[PDB]
């Protein structure tokens, strides 16, 4: 089997991407944030504290003839951005782009933090990291990908995120029309539960490539590119007037600037992030200070190849017995 679904930016900045997901019988379609940095499929629901729901579409398990309470199971998750959610668990039928999994754990939120409430466009998350990170207790549950894997034509999914435009998540096949050149594959460590890999270096604009190992995670659920302070300083030094602002919470730059590209290495291959992808717009409405899309990972504890990086590539998440990651230009 295979599946193919379009993923759409939630706003004009590509702050996140939502993908429609069918849950239950008859189908209830919710728009979920596919997150290769976590491993829980959780949704706003009829059980979510009413004051914490503001415009989201909810899953109502009592209206699904295939929903079953997973007795005694609870979940609770905290994300790198300080947001969180928790609740109980149902199993139900879940389909993405024509690919169906029966008996998928659907984690129903009883509570969500303010950042989730405040984002009316995201109805929940669909985790695509390794199932070892799944938070369900006392019986850990599998991700949608892990459940689908054996049925897929090939044990892979791909992320093809758009810049200010829709893109595609495919399951079970590699669309050879969706990228240019060849796909370069690179090793993955699953030791921390992430799609963790080592970039071979970087360049700023038309500058020379610096060969240096940068360990980090391919994370579709993180907006920006978080890299070591040395790398980030070298990038922003090429933008007149750019500075790190403790009050704003990262590097800002004059909105009048033209940003240089940023290149990262994948083995001997190179992925070029155009400068415009690094612009996250005014820090507040009407400001002439703009927020940068490349930020320091210092104090995160891990480097994160988030959407800023991934949307410059066609990315293969290869879930074969020994997982790997592939990157192509597009």
From Swiss-Prot:
| Keywords assigned by UniProt, alphabetized | Aspartyl protease, Disulfide bond, Hydrolase, Protease, Signal, Zymogen
Which cysteines form disulfides? 255-290
Catalytic residues as annotated in Swiss-Prot or TrEMBL: 35, 199
Question: What EC number(s) does this enzyme carry?
Answer: 3.4.23.22
Query: Is the keyword Transmembrane helix in the record?
Result: no
* EC supergroup of this enzyme: hydrolase
Q: Determine the domain of life of the protein's source.
A: Eukaryota
Ranges of residues in domain Peptidase A1: 17-328
Which GO biological process categories is it annotated with?
Answer: proteolysis
Keyword Zinc, does the record have it? no
Q: Name one GO molecular function term.
A: aspartic-type endopeptidase activity
What reactions does this protein catalyze?
Hydrolysis of proteins with specificity similar to that of pepsin A, prefers hydrophobic residues at P1 and P1', but does not cleave 14-Ala-|-Leu-15 in the B chain of insulin or Z-Glu-Tyr. Clots milk
Which family does the entry's similarity section mention?
Answer: Belongs to the peptidase A1 family.
Instruction: Give the protein name, as stated in the record.
Output: Endothiapepsin
State the organism named in the record: Cryphonectria parasitica (Chestnut blight fungus)
Encoding gene, per UniProt annotation: EAPA
């Amino acid at each position: 089997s295979t599946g193919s679904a379009t993923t759409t930016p939630i706003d004009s900045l590509d702050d996140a991407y939502i993908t429609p997901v069918q849950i239950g019988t008859p189908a209830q379609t919710l728009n979920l944030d596919f997150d290769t940095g976590s491993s829980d499929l959780w949704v706003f629901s009829s059980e979510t504290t009413a004051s914490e729901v503001d415009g989201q579409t909810i899953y109502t398990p009592s209206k699904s003839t295939t929903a079953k309470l997973l007795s005694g199971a609870t979940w609770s998750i905290s994300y790198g951005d300080g947001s969180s959610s928790s609740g109980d668990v149902y199993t139900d039928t879940v389909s993405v782009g024509g690919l169906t999994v029966t008996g998928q754990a659907v984690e129903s939120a009883k509570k969500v933090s303010s950042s989730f409430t405040e984002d009316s466009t995201i109805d929940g998350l669909l985790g695509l990291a390794f199932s070892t990170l799944n938070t369900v207790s006392p019986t850990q549950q599998k991700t949608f990908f892990d459940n689908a894997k054996a049925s897929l034509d090939s044990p892979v999914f791909t992320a093809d995120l758009g810049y200010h435009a829709p893109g595609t998540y495919n399951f079970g096949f590699i669309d050879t029309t969706a990228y240019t050149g060849s796909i370069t594959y690179t090793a993955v460590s699953t030791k921390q539960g992430f799609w963790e890999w080592t970039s071979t270096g970087y360049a700023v604009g038309s500058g020379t490539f610096k060969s240096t190992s940068i360990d980090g995670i391919a994370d579709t659920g993180t907006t920006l590119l978080y890299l070591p302070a040395t790398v980030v300083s070298a990038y922003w030094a090429q933008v007149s007037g750019a500075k790190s602002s403790s009050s704003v919470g990262g590097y800002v730059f004059p909105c009048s600037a033209t940003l240089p590209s940023f290149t990262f290495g994948v083995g001997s291959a190179r992925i070029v992030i155009p400068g415009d992808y690094i612009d996250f717009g005014p820090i507040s409405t009407g400001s002439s200070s703009c927020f940068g899309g490349i930020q320091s990972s210092a104090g995160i504890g891990i480097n994160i190849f988030g959407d800023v990086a991934l949307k410059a590539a066609f990315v293969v998440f290869n879930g074969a017995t020994t997982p790997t990651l592939g990157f192509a230009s597009k």
